[PDB]
Amino acid sequence: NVSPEARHPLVAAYPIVHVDMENIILSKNEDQSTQNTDSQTRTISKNTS
Amino acid sequence: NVSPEARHPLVAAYPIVHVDMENIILSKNEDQSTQNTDSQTRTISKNTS
Amino acid sequence: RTWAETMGLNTADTARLNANIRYVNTGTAPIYNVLPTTSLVLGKNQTLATIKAKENQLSQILAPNNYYPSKNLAPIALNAQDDFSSTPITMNYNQFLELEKTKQLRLDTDQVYGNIATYNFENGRVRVDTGSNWSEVLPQIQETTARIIFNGKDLNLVERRIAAVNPSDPLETTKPDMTLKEALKIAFGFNEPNGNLQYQGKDITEFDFNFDQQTSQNIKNQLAELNATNIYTVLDKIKLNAKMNILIRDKRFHYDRNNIAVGADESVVKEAHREVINSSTEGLLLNIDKDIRKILSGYIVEIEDTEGLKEVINDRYDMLNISSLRQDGKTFIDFKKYNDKLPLYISNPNYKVNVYAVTKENTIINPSENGDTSTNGIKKILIFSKKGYEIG
């Protein structure tokens, strides 16, 4: 894989690695929560006077 | 297991692997609960005026 | 009496994933302890995760033309991202809504780890060397050999490599001189029984030689000095070289950019569909060419009167599932499989039967613009024109 310019003894063969970023995907941490409720009251009072 | 048309000294013998996907099982991470409340109240009130 | 009900969430961990994968080896040598790095891509190129396979998804030997896990078994599950398979593969809220809306998700294969196994002269046993892997060997094959792809055996890409000479390197000027005819004779099984380079049935002039850019620049400079003009006559004088690509296809069809047979031309469709044995109102026992079987979608029945008109029962693409593929080497195109076991609309022998065909170059799968979910966007070559009592 050593490219043919470097097969001469006086030319050095070395890699030049360089990372480039193409996307940032950021995920916001949060937590929704819904809640429904029913309630049925039955009051039977009695007032004596 | 080197396949027989590769046995010739001039025919190279090498594997070609690839992965192919047949299903995707997404599992929604949601939590749920219920509740059941049955109360009872006994109001007793005296009232002098 | 109270009743409550809750439904939580988390907008960074709102779904999990589980991919069912399978490995294929289409080379000429086996690979041991396979561990493929692979990545789940959403949308166009929005990569959720990259996962090198863990030990649960580790194959142990993948011989050529074999699957792991084997084809009678179910695929393996990839549901991990930790190095110990204790952490699932998650997905946030936007990605989950988008995947549930548009249903786009693929899986790329970036690279593959895997060992090599070598013959041991003491006891003849084969030892797997865990310090070696095929990532040190394939780049040396790829820089000193010549690739010949070929699809004349049942229309699939059979890639080989033949060790040819590189003229600007002293160690590679030592290999013997490799011509194109000898390369085809030792890599694929082409033989010359009467002084003509043939395959099993065909001739070499029934194929065509699409090259790459630099390879064609070499071939034209080779044919200049040869004082020849046809490639098919001077196959035994074309030297090969290193880093060559040669692509040999079948001259009978057309292909897409991905080099798959997706349709022929119009003449060769009718030439191998005509030998019939069984015939009734239940089913049509035709024979189908194996090549043209791979491009045909399905057969669509028609009814024609004494005058000549059309009556298409199956004006719907989910009624194109008419084909049967039995063990006796024929097809059996039925008639009641998509008619709820009620027969055809044949009342008279003078009413003839007619089926019009279509190749994958000429089909549609999704709906049309306004209302043509029918057979008006189906291009047809005349195959089937015979009477109704000559078929039953």
Add this chain to the structure above:
Amino acid sequence: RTWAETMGLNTADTARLNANIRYVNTGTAPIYNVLPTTSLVLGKNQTLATIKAKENQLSQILAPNNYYPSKNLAPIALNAQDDFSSTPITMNYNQFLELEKTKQLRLDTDQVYGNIATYNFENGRVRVDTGSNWSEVLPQIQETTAR
């Protein structure tokens, strides 16, 4: 009847990150088992993290004038800080507000690990030695040559 609606938060762990990266070798000789160290810079020179590439982000060969993964394939994902990829890359609340306001986050490259594959005279093969990286070689090239 009732209807509730709740939204929690945590002001040191408000967002997570996932960078899509790709490696290039423009040099002259390949490098095996590549493992870059990359740091995620927010703003001018405020640094959120410094991540060596884990096992999921390792490139086995990177031949000269080649990419990893290739230009037809989507980039790899870097979303881990633990040695075993079981911990996400986070940010607090102020960094999330600034990032959504101004949109400045880049990727530096500090150093790159990777091995050499030398010849074997005995059987002609080429075997990666896993006890020597290019960081013993490249400072010696950089001092006896001319650019």
